[PDB]
Amino acid sequence: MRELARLERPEILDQYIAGQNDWMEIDQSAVWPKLTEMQGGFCAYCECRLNRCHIEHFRPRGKFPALTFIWNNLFGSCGDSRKSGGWSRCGIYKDNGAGAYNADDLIKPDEENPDDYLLFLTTGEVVPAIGLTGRALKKAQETIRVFNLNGDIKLFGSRRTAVQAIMPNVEYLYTLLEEFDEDDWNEMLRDELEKIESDEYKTALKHAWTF
Amino acid sequence: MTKQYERKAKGGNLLSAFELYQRNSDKAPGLGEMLVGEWFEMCRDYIQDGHVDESGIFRPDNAFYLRRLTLKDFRRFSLLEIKLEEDLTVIIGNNGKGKTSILYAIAKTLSWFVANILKEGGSGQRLSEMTDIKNDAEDRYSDVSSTFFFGKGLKSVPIRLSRSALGTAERRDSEVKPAKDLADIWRVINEVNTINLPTFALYNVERSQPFNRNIKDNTGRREERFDAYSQTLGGAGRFDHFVEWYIYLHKRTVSDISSSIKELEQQVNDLQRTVDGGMVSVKSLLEQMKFKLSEAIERNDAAVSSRVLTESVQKSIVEKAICSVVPSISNIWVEMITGSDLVKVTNDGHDVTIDQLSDGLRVFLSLVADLARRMVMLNPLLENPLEGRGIVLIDQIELHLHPKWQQEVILNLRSAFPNIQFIITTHSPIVLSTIEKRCIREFEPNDDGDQSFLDSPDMQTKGSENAQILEQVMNVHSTPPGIAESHWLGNFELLLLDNSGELDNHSQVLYDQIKAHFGIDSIELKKADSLIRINKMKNKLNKIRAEKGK
Amino acid sequence: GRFDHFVEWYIYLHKRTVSDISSSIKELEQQVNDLQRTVDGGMVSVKSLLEQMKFKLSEAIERNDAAVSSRVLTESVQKSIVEKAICSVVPSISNIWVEMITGSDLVKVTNDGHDVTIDQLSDGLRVFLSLVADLARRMVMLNPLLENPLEGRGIVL
Amino acid sequence: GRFDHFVEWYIYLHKRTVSDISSSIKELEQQVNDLQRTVDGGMVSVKSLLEQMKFKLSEAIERNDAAVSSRVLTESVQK
Incomplete structure (x- = not known):
């Protein structure tokens, strides 16, 4: 999720x-x-x-x-x-x-960053982040298990089609990396960071755009 | 008291003129000269006014439909309130949600309308006291409350159907008096002048029945108007009555109306030949044909006279309805062979008899043909008798139908029958792809019976994809979760982001499984290839950003 | 199919559980449970008459079951295999039994979480239950020699 | 006379008085009396974990009173 x-x-x-x-x-x-x-x-x-x-x-x-x-x-x-x-x-x-569930077994979006503990794939499914072991891995499983991201159909399918609706956009914007220069090609990614906030899904499209 | 009723009649009300008609109709003229006539004229106007709009469809000024349905302790529903649309209402949900029970309750409500139209002081069907009562409920009675709309003069026609289990202290009863009153108005104005009665029909699961074709059920009654109400809320479409009526129409078209009435007078002349041959000895057929002339006098006079339109036009209208709604059948016509009279259709260019039609193209013809029969028999004062009022309860319209043919079934039904309030309960998303969002009632998949409302889905279903309707409205995955071959893209992305986007040891062999399974031209392998290129050149962006940062 | 035949065979098989027809087992059903009511091994000398009152009654109900387990099928085993097949295949039914707490022989299922009669079921769960129940009945009464009679040969359309 | 309705009524009456208030309360009372006649001397270990059936005796006494809270024939008294 997002830094609030x-x-x-x-x-x-x-x-x-x-x-x-x-x-x-x-x-x-x-x-x-x-x-x-x-x-x-x-x-x-x-x-x-x-x-x-x-x-x-x-x-x-x-x-x-x-x-x-x-x-x-x-x-x-x-x-x-x-x-x-x-x-x-x-x-x-x-x-x-x-x-x-436990109080410390949950991720809180106010101060703790959800970018390095959970990972939104391109298929709409959430996984734990790579290299994560132990209490934080158990927390990353437990938050998904209690919040039903891997779960209900209206959320999972909508997130899947929202990420899959921009796959030609990501493909054709990324395949021109050698054609365009440094500053004016990173201007595309700042354009995406100015684009995505007027949508429903933000961190899923963040994970689809960059890493 | 009389003045208040006359003021209400001037302000506009069907019921307010009815007791005035009933109190002034029993005396003599002079005291009844123009008095009975103005209330009769106003009542028949309130029934029969209608206009043709800009699209060419006759629309009545006082439409009749069902507004609200309330089920209290009925089967699985604690207290459920449903608001029904004017033209189409779709009830969707899992197997277990009481969406056949809703149609059963509405059919039990409409049985009182049908019976009280058919016979004065009649009794309709009643709720069962063994299964319809909720077995969890402690009040031990169940009531089904409905409200009907019949124009601006008649805003509400309440009806309640109550039933108590055996052993209760208080015997709960119905309040079917407004249904009694409205059907009394319709019947007693129909007995003295012809009107357009509404069509009440229920097409439940039991329409899925085999055709016998050796059907010699009682011959003679299947041409009278009130036969159209015979077992119309039973659940199964009376295809027997339709095919007997259609053989009647074929015989009357080819013989009785092309060159006048002949098949009765030829055997009349046979009796005049054999009446003076000596000893008579023919008393068995002396009288059994003599009342056939009386039958053709007192029954066909309605159908040829001004009240009921021309029989060849009836045949053309029911054939047009069948070939318009029913998908691949384009013409229907009757053959008369020596000793047999059989109906054949043109299915996909092939002349196929009805009994060997397919079971998915015959149980929809059993709906459309029977419905068109009841409209053309009950609404004969219209240029298009398929534009008459009524309530029709179809259960699972998508039954036995291909997904190609589910894309046009409700569009064809609403095109042919514009003034019918269809109430259907489908299971398929493809039928929902042709139906507006506001016409859909839904059940959540956690619905133990406590809800006091059924609400429409959040997203519009009129132009959405079938995968979107299935996966947003019906809560079903597009790709099955019980298959290990369906999660292969997710396992591919997990094993590919484990090693930072390189096809080293696991992702390459799992890519080989995807390529060997789904195929070379497969869209799943197309997503896999696109994600492979995007995530193999992502490390180049990582290196460029690292060189920029440090 | 024959769902009325399945229902009649099911109530028959439940009433024959567990005393059968050899009787033998019926003459080891009634008085065996009535020992502990009256005299309980004689003035409660040995109360349970060893722990053999459990383990399916001193393996003497099992005396007409040890050669009736898989050489033929015991009727309780037949009923349990049909029950397992119905609850395993058919959706939103997880238990099935026969009750006579009223005066009638009626079978009940556990649709979702509510114990409802077969005539108080859906028209899409009852049809599939009739198909699976009838087919599982025919397999368990045409394959007596199998440990699991549903793993038998056949062709079904 | 209908000796077809009597058979249905008889099997009905036997079914509602076999898995309900039935001819087993005498067996339960005899079981409690026979257990009490032996545990009077001692050895209440066979009474402690068999106390569930002795409490189920009073539980079977419960739900019976509503059948006999009125002047009407009990279904096991008609039979």
Whole structure:
């Protein structure tokens, strides 16, 4: 996934304190314009467009009750809880499906870089990164197992066709490496880094474009 | 009290004039002069007004359809609310989601309409008390609630069908009184002047039945209009009735109407020859033909008279409907051999008899022919009787059909029957590729029955690829996950990025397996080759970027 | 196929499980379980009459099974092989049995997670269940000598 | 007289009183009495892990009371 720049704590959640009241008392509309500035209106778990969205807690509220009002726990979720069952990805799947998991067994997109631990292939399938062994390898397996990237059909097929829709673009832009010069050919890759952010999938196309 | 009903009739309502008609029709004229006539004229206008639009299709001013369907404790549904479209509604889902149960509930609802049209004070079908009740539910009763739309004067026609399991303290009952009222209006205006009754049909799985062709089921009734409602919600299309009706039409076209009525008068003249031959001794055939003349008098007068259109036009219209909707059959016609009367079609240029037609081209003709028969018998005041109102419940329209022929089945059906609200429950993505997004109801593949709504898919399915519809709407991979030969590109990319994009020891031999399996001209090997070139020249970019950086 | 024949053979085979027809086994079914109710080895002297009440009842129910395991098929083994074939092939059914907690002989399956009757199934799972169930029935009652009778010769259209 | 409906009614009544409240509560009570007549002296090791069936005796006493919470014939009393 993407580096999310944790910019500034909003002043809405400073007045309400955990323990005295639950999460339902706050209005839900005062945090979304703060979150969409750093997320681009995207679920940062399926790396994922928010046609419908809700607020997802990275660590669960029932297990760690004095963690919800810190603002380091709030993210966007692919889909909404109002579906009478919900989806099977991003935020809903961790709280509904999967199973037991540890707090340190998960990758957090605020400070930890997901580029060197997981790897988006050209076929839409995610693998662990090469040379990765041990606790971080177990973490890279566990995050995919709880977030269902290798998983539900509507995410996997859409990511596969989004990466496969630019394969002639990548092929014909790369085959002119000897034809073009250094600065004006790396200008193509800065053009891609200025292009890809107005899409659903960013790091998958980053892995398809460069390495 | 009378004034309020007259004000409601002036404002526009079908039901408000009905009790006025029922209270003033029983007295004498003078007190009924123009009084009964204006409510009859307004009621028949509210039934029969319609206009031809810019595309040439007759559209009624007061369309009849089903708006909402609510199932409470019915089979697997706790409390399910479905909003149905005006023209086409598609219900999709896995095997196990109750999408045949929805059609069964709507058919049980429409049975009251059919029975109350057919006979005054009639009773339709009822819910079973052994299987339709939810075996998990604790209330021990199930009700199916529907709402019907019949124009601006009639916004809502409610109906509930209730059934309780045996042993309950309170006996739950139906509230089919508005269905009773609407079918009473239709029947008592139809008994005195001809109208265009709607078509109610259900085509369930049991249309997939073999053809017998030795069918001598009861001869004489298969030309009357109310025979068109005979077992129309049973589930199987009455192809027996259609083929008997079509032999009737062939005989009447070639003999009874080309050179006037002859086959009855020739044996009438035979009786006049044999009536004075001495001892009579022919009482067995003296009277069994005498009421055949009465049959041809009191039944064919409707079909030749102004109420029901010309029989040769009926034959042309049903033949046009069959050759327009049914894919490869282009003409249908009857042969009369010595002792036999058999119908043959032109399937792909070959004259093939019906009984040896294919099972995927005969159980669709059993739908289209029977539906066209019921429209041309029930809607005879139209230039195109296929433009009449009605509700038709097809179960799995893609049954026995090739994917080539699934690309046009619902387009052909909606083209031939524009005013019919089809409610179909398909399994294939290719049928969904010809149907709008808003016409589709769907079930998620986690749907234990608790949902109070069925919603459309997120992506548009009208022009999408079949792989996209299968892999976004129906939640199925394009390439199977139970096959080790399908993940070979993923294992290729894993083993190729393990050694930084070089075909050293594993990637080369796995590339040999892909080349020996999928083939030289295979698109999978085309992706493999493109990724090989792109990832072998990526190390050149790595070296150039390293030289730039340091 | 003959799915009514399969259902009748299935309820028949379940009622014959496990006492058969030699009887013998029926005369080693009723009174054997009724020893521990009444006197339990005599005033509970030896309570279980050794641990041979388990291991399929002192291998004496197995006395009409040791030459009936694979030389012919034991009827419990026939029923279990048909059950395994149905649950292995047919999709979204993972258990099948016969109940008479009501007054009628009716078979039930475990469609998804809900225990429903065959007449309360789909029309696409019941048809495939009829095909697989009938074919597995014909293999287990035409191949008596096999360890797994589904690995037999045949041609199926 | 229909000695066709009686056979169906009889097999029906035997089926709902074989895997339900049936003629096995006497066997369970005799089993508990015979076990108690021997464990009275001692050796409760054959009672500790056989206590599940003795609790299942009271569990079979449960769900029976709803059949006899009214003045009506029990299905095993009709037979």
